[PDB]
């Protein structure tokens, strides 16, 4: 599945892009999804403790929760909220 | 008569009067409002503005959750949540929340719950812009 | 150096949330809480067209000044505005608007809450429901 | 002294007047003062249990409190209040 990754706040300063596309298997482990992201941007390693995800606009912890991702789905990288 | 959940994100100047107006009900004797505004100082430095970025339409949806949970806890009628996006200068409003109810205790407690839970669960970030 | 203000007004005029919210804005303040009391169209089963309010002035004024002063003994607030309308307040129009500004939000919410409670308990004001 | 009695809300409906002047000794206890007022409009007997005084704009409970009243002081008859 070709998925959209969105970098909010700190995460975008580090990556240098607000978003990118990645190809991942439909069935993937939340932390696996993480490793794929770090690989494109090893720097994110430094912010790892401070990030959470959002899949199809619902939150999810960076665990071994099993995800099912369809093409075009959004994955938000959400550092700590200050609204 | 129909209970309203009015949620809006906008880059326009927010109006307290316009938002209070949206929660008025003949059945309600109470309206509580919270208004957040840009302070002119942070950690001892002087501040000219605040920049707000959000993840929509997730933010709007995390605000719906907060409404729903509010209506389960407290007999409220109307709820308005307006957040400004972009640059919010000193003394201008970044957020306005308004809740109406029959009696005051519900509106006061709902508003307080809204702002706390909004600051914790809703995907919004701010950068301070200095002098 | 911006002076702290306690703005207190009893009046037959229609109250403006925008007016009152402006009286408490402060570049040193990040939070404004407001409470707005409005006439309901019913009471204990009967339909209501208007409330009528009277007060013992200037004592109601003094009693609100005491509320202002007590609020500032606990909470780090900047400005407090208390506007109460007198005589005839028809349905959906405001009888009271209280606003408080402070640097952070708990102070402004708690002080507004203490203000309306204390006003209802202590300030010599009275309402008469006018029915259909 | 000659003092001004102010009647608010219900109490004005009963007495039938917003205010009047009456004469009172210099020292009088608050219950004694209420008794004078009650005497003067016996309808007020009905609410004897739900009223407070303000004397010179400060609350006074109807009991042994000793009042030292000066000419022109205001004595307000305060039924249970209902602001906001």
XYZ file of C-alpha atoms in Angstrom:
430
model
C 0.000 0.000 0.000
C 1.252 3.435 -0.924
C 0.555 5.447 2.222
C 0.887 9.117 3.091
C 3.091 10.027 6.047
C 2.538 13.479 7.591
C 5.114 15.087 9.788
C 3.673 17.626 12.254
C 5.785 20.171 14.227
C 9.212 18.925 15.552
C 9.018 15.866 13.201
C 8.919 18.085 10.089
C 11.895 20.256 11.190
C 13.901 17.001 11.499
C 12.678 15.345 8.301
C 12.763 18.524 6.202
C 9.373 17.622 4.561
C 5.756 18.128 5.765
C 4.855 14.804 4.153
C 6.026 11.801 2.024
C 4.735 8.647 0.357
C 5.815 5.201 1.474
C 5.067 1.663 0.328
C 4.332 -0.766 3.188
C 2.562 -4.046 3.392
C -1.150 -3.916 4.044
C -0.720 -5.701 7.340
C 2.018 -4.111 9.400
C 3.096 -3.720 13.034
C 2.837 -0.141 14.445
C 6.534 -0.300 15.554
C 7.358 -1.780 12.109
C 5.702 1.264 10.577
C 8.004 3.301 12.819
C 11.205 1.467 11.683
C 10.204 2.195 8.056
C 9.956 5.889 8.918
C 13.192 6.099 10.886
C 14.970 4.418 7.904
C 13.999 7.250 5.572
C 14.925 9.805 8.263
C 17.404 8.367 10.821
C 17.258 11.684 12.614
C 13.760 10.834 13.844
C 15.582 8.418 16.051
C 16.291 11.371 18.419
C 12.514 12.227 18.750
C 11.328 8.547 19.004
C 10.328 8.676 22.687
C 8.254 11.840 22.033
C 6.064 10.763 18.932
C 2.627 9.119 18.526
C 0.682 8.037 15.341
C -2.745 8.634 13.910
C -4.073 6.201 11.337
C -7.038 7.240 9.271
C -7.469 10.123 11.768
C -7.617 7.903 14.916
C -4.741 7.706 17.379
C -2.621 4.597 17.888
C 0.397 3.760 20.154
C 3.814 2.738 18.680
C 3.439 -0.970 19.844
C 2.782 -4.390 18.242
C -0.757 -3.367 17.584
C -1.558 -4.818 14.081
C -2.527 -2.266 11.445
C -4.344 -2.730 8.184
C -3.416 0.005 5.755
C -5.108 0.613 2.384
C -3.634 2.669 -0.461
C -3.800 6.382 0.077
C -4.338 6.171 3.866
C -2.790 8.877 6.052
C -0.381 8.189 8.898
C 0.241 11.274 11.091
C 3.451 11.588 13.111
C 2.208 13.596 16.159
C 4.786 15.060 18.598
C 3.434 16.529 21.933
C 0.190 18.641 21.465
C 0.290 22.498 22.378
C -3.164 23.848 21.177
C -34.608 23.513 19.833
C -32.116 21.281 17.956
C -28.900 21.021 20.078
C -25.883 22.271 18.085
C -22.185 21.348 18.000
C -20.622 24.237 16.124
C -16.955 23.566 15.381
C -14.854 25.690 13.145
C -11.238 26.250 12.307
C -10.472 29.455 10.475
C -7.684 31.865 9.782
C -10.033 34.814 10.435
C -10.161 37.043 13.520
C -12.429 35.347 16.019
C -15.433 37.272 17.498
C -16.712 36.705 21.033
C -20.068 38.188 20.138
C -20.572 36.065 17.065
C -19.690 32.889 19.022
C -21.865 33.726 22.099
C -24.715 34.326 19.637
C -24.436 30.765 18.267
C -25.136 29.140 21.702
C -28.109 31.247 22.750
C -31.191 29.273 23.582
C -34.486 30.441 25.132
C -34.249 27.267 27.203
C -30.863 28.226 28.663
C -30.192 30.638 31.478
C -26.412 30.211 31.355
C -23.581 30.612 28.901
C -19.955 30.104 29.853
C -17.143 31.194 27.534
C -13.387 30.569 27.471
C -11.261 32.805 25.263
C -7.503 32.242 24.817
C -5.481 35.159 23.557
C -1.867 35.734 22.623
C 0.240 36.984 25.520
C 3.091 39.325 24.842
C 5.753 37.379 26.714
C 7.031 33.878 27.099
C 9.758 32.603 29.425
C 10.875 36.241 29.846
C 11.200 37.039 26.120
C 8.805 39.506 24.396
C 6.298 37.919 21.954
C 4.758 39.610 18.818
C 2.602 36.705 17.706
C 1.653 33.024 17.998
C 1.540 30.649 15.019
C -0.976 27.825 15.076
C -0.924 24.737 12.809
C -3.512 21.927 13.068
C -4.148 18.493 11.565
C -7.616 18.745 10.004
C -10.050 17.215 9.720
C -8.809 15.054 12.600
C -8.750 18.047 15.050
C -12.360 18.781 14.239
C -13.122 15.197 14.925
C -11.270 15.048 18.232
C -13.410 18.114 19.164
C -16.584 16.165 18.221
C -15.521 13.461 20.666
C -15.099 16.079 23.379
C -18.588 17.441 22.631
C -20.214 14.021 22.816
C -18.492 13.155 26.069
C -19.556 16.549 27.409
C -23.223 15.777 26.609
C -22.969 12.486 28.443
C -21.564 14.145 31.588
C -23.691 17.376 31.785
C -27.126 18.595 30.638
C -25.854 21.100 28.087
C -27.587 22.478 25.016
C -25.261 24.262 22.546
C -21.433 23.960 22.265
C -19.261 26.206 20.065
C -15.575 25.605 19.524
C -13.687 27.965 17.287
C -9.895 27.858 16.963
C -7.893 30.316 14.844
C -5.123 29.017 12.590
C -2.068 30.933 11.400
C -0.625 34.021 13.027
C -2.493 35.257 16.083
C -1.182 38.627 17.210
C -0.912 39.877 20.755
C -4.313 40.307 22.425
C -6.230 38.593 19.661
C -8.081 35.355 20.297
C -6.707 31.901 19.315
C -9.692 30.035 20.807
C -13.204 30.650 21.865
C -15.308 27.973 23.521
C -18.950 28.581 24.498
C -21.491 26.245 26.137
C -25.113 26.943 27.065
C -27.316 25.146 29.601
C -30.390 25.541 31.792
C -28.291 26.318 34.824
C -24.864 27.620 35.371
C -23.041 24.688 36.912
C -23.204 22.560 33.744
C -21.893 25.343 31.406
C -19.000 26.227 33.756
C -17.931 22.656 34.228
C -18.319 21.811 30.497
C -16.257 24.745 29.408
C -13.507 23.857 31.820
C -13.545 20.229 30.643
C -13.474 21.358 26.989
C -10.413 23.518 27.307
C -8.508 20.974 29.394
C -9.329 18.081 27.130
C -8.774 20.180 23.979
C -5.237 21.125 25.265
C -4.513 17.388 25.816
C -6.149 15.382 23.034
C -6.512 17.717 19.962
C -3.728 17.810 17.272
C -2.706 21.470 17.313
C 0.675 23.057 17.795
C 1.849 26.634 18.305
C 5.176 28.378 17.750
C 5.977 31.622 19.603
C 7.173 34.511 17.321
C 9.514 36.893 19.253
C 10.756 40.571 19.054
C 2.874 49.026 33.880
C -0.893 48.385 33.114
C -3.107 49.095 36.163
C -5.398 46.248 37.254
C -9.067 47.164 36.838
C -12.280 46.189 38.588
C -15.053 47.478 36.223
C -18.462 47.309 37.855
C -21.658 48.497 36.330
C -25.338 48.276 37.097
C -27.447 49.530 34.208
C -30.808 49.466 32.378
C -28.928 49.176 29.083
C -28.737 45.914 27.092
C -25.385 44.233 27.916
C -22.804 43.485 25.250
C -20.524 40.426 25.563
C -18.127 42.053 23.118
C -18.052 45.340 25.001
C -17.409 43.548 28.321
C -14.881 41.068 26.985
C -12.905 44.113 25.616
C -12.820 45.738 29.014
C -10.756 42.823 30.341
C -8.290 42.149 27.478
C -4.608 42.476 28.466
C -1.408 41.821 26.492
C -0.167 40.198 29.699
C -3.187 37.840 29.653
C -3.708 34.590 27.809
C -7.136 33.651 29.236
C -10.536 35.327 29.563
C -13.404 33.398 31.117
C -16.901 34.816 30.837
C -20.263 33.994 32.356
C -23.464 35.280 30.776
C -26.794 34.945 32.546
C -29.827 34.988 30.259
C -33.575 34.977 30.791
C -35.112 31.506 30.242
C -38.587 31.274 28.677
C -39.937 29.036 31.500
C -39.913 28.434 35.287
C -41.271 25.512 37.386
C -43.591 24.527 34.493
C -45.012 28.003 33.635
C -43.936 29.985 30.457
C -41.844 33.168 31.135
C -41.701 36.332 28.917
C -39.323 38.478 30.947
C -37.515 38.681 34.273
C -37.507 41.925 36.242
C -34.472 42.784 38.397
C -33.976 45.311 41.135
C -31.101 46.071 43.429
C -30.047 47.923 46.550
C -27.578 50.386 45.075
C -24.989 51.388 45.992
C -24.617 48.388 48.366
C -24.732 45.871 45.499
C -21.850 47.812 44.051
C -19.876 47.657 47.264
C -20.609 43.923 47.597
C -19.295 43.262 44.145
C -16.170 45.321 45.055
C -15.703 42.935 47.925
C -16.003 39.999 45.573
C -13.328 41.612 43.330
C -11.035 42.087 46.240
C -11.466 38.579 47.599
C -10.846 37.145 44.168
C -7.539 39.026 44.027
C -6.575 37.630 47.463
C -6.516 34.115 46.044
C -6.198 34.134 42.253
C -3.593 35.899 39.928
C -6.148 37.746 37.830
C -5.574 40.963 35.938
C -8.982 42.591 35.175
C -12.558 41.760 36.449
C -15.670 43.172 34.800
C -19.142 42.667 36.340
C -22.115 44.017 34.456
C -25.600 43.539 35.798
C -28.752 44.700 34.029
C -31.656 46.114 35.979
C -35.414 46.286 35.322
C -36.779 44.247 32.398
C -34.668 41.525 30.847
C -36.645 39.749 28.160
C -36.053 36.138 27.083
C -32.618 35.346 25.666
C -31.111 38.732 26.634
C -28.421 38.957 29.247
C -29.050 39.911 32.865
C -25.372 39.526 33.938
C -21.989 39.289 32.282
C -18.901 38.553 34.302
C -15.488 38.422 32.754
C -11.990 37.774 34.225
C -8.566 37.867 32.507
C -5.338 36.294 33.773
C -2.000 34.906 32.525
C -3.206 31.250 32.802
C -6.623 29.612 32.521
C -7.469 28.036 35.853
C -7.464 31.424 37.583
C -9.877 32.998 35.142
C -12.287 29.991 35.209
C -12.225 29.590 38.941
C -12.614 33.334 39.642
C -15.592 33.597 37.296
C -17.151 30.674 38.997
C -16.579 32.146 42.483
C -17.894 35.520 41.251
C -21.264 34.257 39.970
C -21.785 32.011 43.009
C -20.882 34.671 45.459
C -22.980 37.245 43.614
C -26.035 34.963 43.854
C -25.380 34.352 47.534
C -24.384 37.818 48.793
C -25.311 40.682 46.480
C -28.673 42.512 47.248
C -30.373 41.929 43.898
C -33.784 40.249 43.307
C -35.743 38.949 40.285
C -39.454 38.634 39.565
C -40.554 36.178 36.865
C -43.116 37.653 34.616
C -45.391 34.969 33.170
C -47.850 34.549 30.361
C -32.402 59.115 65.426
C -34.557 59.402 62.349
C -33.537 56.542 60.033
C -34.705 55.498 56.549
C -36.140 51.957 56.240
C -35.815 50.490 52.764
C -38.143 47.645 51.674
C -36.977 45.463 48.793
C -38.743 42.881 46.608
C -41.631 41.001 48.415
C -41.269 43.250 51.536
C -42.234 46.297 49.483
C -45.333 44.381 48.156
C -46.427 43.608 51.775
C -45.670 46.986 53.472
C -46.858 48.586 50.268
C -43.970 51.093 50.203
C -40.344 51.353 48.838
C -39.211 53.364 51.900
C -40.148 55.359 54.998
C -38.521 57.217 57.900
C -39.054 56.207 61.453
C -37.492 57.189 64.789
C -35.404 54.844 66.829
C -33.306 55.146 69.938
C -29.581 55.494 69.585
C -28.941 52.101 70.999
C -31.355 49.378 69.940
C -30.792 45.654 69.443
C -31.559 44.299 65.984
C -34.495 42.089 67.106
C -35.963 45.152 68.905
C -35.589 47.095 65.600
C -37.302 44.366 63.604
C -40.149 44.317 66.244
C -40.627 48.112 65.613
C -40.767 47.468 61.879
C -43.050 44.399 62.212
C -45.351 46.390 64.549
C -45.627 48.996 61.829
C -46.616 46.678 58.957
C -47.924 43.465 60.520
C -47.966 41.624 57.114
C -44.151 41.413 57.512
C -44.763 38.879 60.351
C -45.116 36.161 57.713
C -41.534 36.530 56.502
C -39.958 37.238 59.887
C -37.916 34.063 59.391
C -36.469 34.819 55.944
C -35.194 38.361 56.201
C -31.873 40.014 56.957
C -30.968 43.608 57.610
C -28.421 45.816 55.973
C -27.485 48.723 58.305
C -25.317 51.317 56.622
C -24.980 48.760 53.794
C -23.601 45.922 55.923
C -25.504 42.782 56.741
C -26.894 42.318 60.207
C -28.699 39.278 61.474
C -31.810 39.817 63.548
C -30.573 39.057 67.086
C -28.740 40.487 70.079
C -26.530 42.622 67.867
C -26.434 46.080 69.429
C -27.039 48.859 66.870
C -25.811 52.392 67.239
C -27.813 54.277 64.643
C -27.063 57.810 63.464
C -29.429 60.159 61.770
C -30.083 59.243 58.167
C -28.641 55.779 58.396
C -30.267 53.307 56.064
C -31.891 50.127 57.341
C -32.728 47.835 54.417
C -35.134 44.932 54.759
C -33.520 42.164 52.682
C -35.704 39.198 51.603
C -33.813 36.090 50.318
C -31.791 37.238 47.358
C -31.881 36.187 43.687
C -29.232 38.047 41.591
C -27.867 36.833 38.280
